[PDB]
Ligand binder design. Structure first.
Ligand SMILES: C/C(=C\COP(=O)(O)OP(=O)(O)O)CO
Ligand SMILES: C/C(=C\COP(=O)(O)OP(=O)(O)O)CO
Lengths: 191, 191
């Protein structure tokens, strides 16, 4: 069940060793020293406007992108009451206010808002019903087949899969947090 | 106060999301479908050889181990008249009969026998005197300080702290039940 999940993911997808890129992180984000976790600060840091940095979206990326193959990583979201995670195109508009995070705008993400509302960030947003709140989420990228999927990485249940896409840009792991709370997002070691 | 215990656990220790590993579970144990609970059976299962499995001790482990950091989880023991819980080293002699569960053998555990006799499984065993019987037990690991502690998770009260170890191996949550009875051991998910 969980076991079947682990066997399936290990057979089919390459483990990506994701580390967060402080240079991309909106100034309201604190990336941990080990670059595995990200937290939202109360006050923004005073950081330069280098082209890589998100200036509007409360986002940070992985250091490395994907251009082909099947890849997965897992993110511990624990009890944090707001988070959205997935992948985004390298050429997302990092410097424009109010760009909706949607596949059309180079984002493939899902998560949680207001403690209990699960969504996939489609346009319009898709509401999800998950019998069990995930503590750890498996993100899955099949670049060739154009498929971004999410699983509960502990009990192996399927969370969501985006419609078929035809990727024309490299894809980054992306992480977004809006609220001030205690629990971090953490990229966990993967089998 | 339970309030102080709540604040303390939440400030200092990362909440471990513990799921029982059925491949480790001695064949006389039955792990629930959600792998949050374990019960002792009257008859063993007939299973294929597995290196991970406890052959002698009536034990099951968590799926994940700890190699650094401060971690806690909380176990519902209910009115069950016999149980022992804690952590053990990854390299405990799983396959060997008659190994005493003690710190020298890779185990740091405490619990209940015969309804009313609480013990820490030191060598010798140290008898505990608990003003009230717990129904939920908080297990606390601080890997750097070598500190394994047990608390009454409802009212915050201290149950037992082992002499500080110098851990040189990854640590698993471990769970042992000997006796036949209706109340399972249950891991309460992250609050
Ligand atoms: C302010 C902000 C994001 C909120 O965006 P939205 O208000 O469009 O809502 P959502 O559906 O969650 O994307 C910065 O990332
Ligand atoms: C039979 C058994 C465990 C009990 O071992 P022991 O009989 O040595 O007693 P204890 O002091 O509770 O460890 C299988 O796990």
């Amino acid at each position: 069940a969980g076991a079947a999940y682990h066997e399936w993911k290990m057979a089919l997808f390459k483990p990506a060793d994701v580390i967060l890129d402080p240079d991309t992180a909106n100034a309201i984000l604190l990336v941990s020293e080990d670059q595995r976790s990200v937290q939202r600060a109360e006050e923004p840091r005073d950081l330069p406007d280098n082209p890589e940095r998100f200036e509007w979206h409360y986002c940070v990326l992985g250091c490395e992108n994907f251009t082909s193959g099947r890849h997965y990583w897992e993110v511990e979201v624990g009890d944090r009451k707001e988070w959205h995670i997935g992948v985004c195109s390298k050429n997302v508009e990092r410097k424009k206010g109010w760009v909706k995070m949607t596949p059309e705008n180079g984002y493939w993400t899902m998560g949680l808002t207001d403690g209990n509302k699960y969504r996939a960030l489609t346009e319009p947003r898709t509401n999800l019903k998950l019998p069990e709140p995930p503590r750890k989420v498996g993100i899955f990228l099949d670049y060739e087949t154009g498929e971004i999927s999410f699983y509960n990485a502990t009990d192996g249940s399927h969370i969501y899969t985006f419609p078929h896409a035809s990727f024309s840009e490299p894809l980054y792991p992306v992480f977004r947090i809006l609220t001030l709370e205690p629990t971090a997002l953490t990229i966990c070691p993967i089998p």
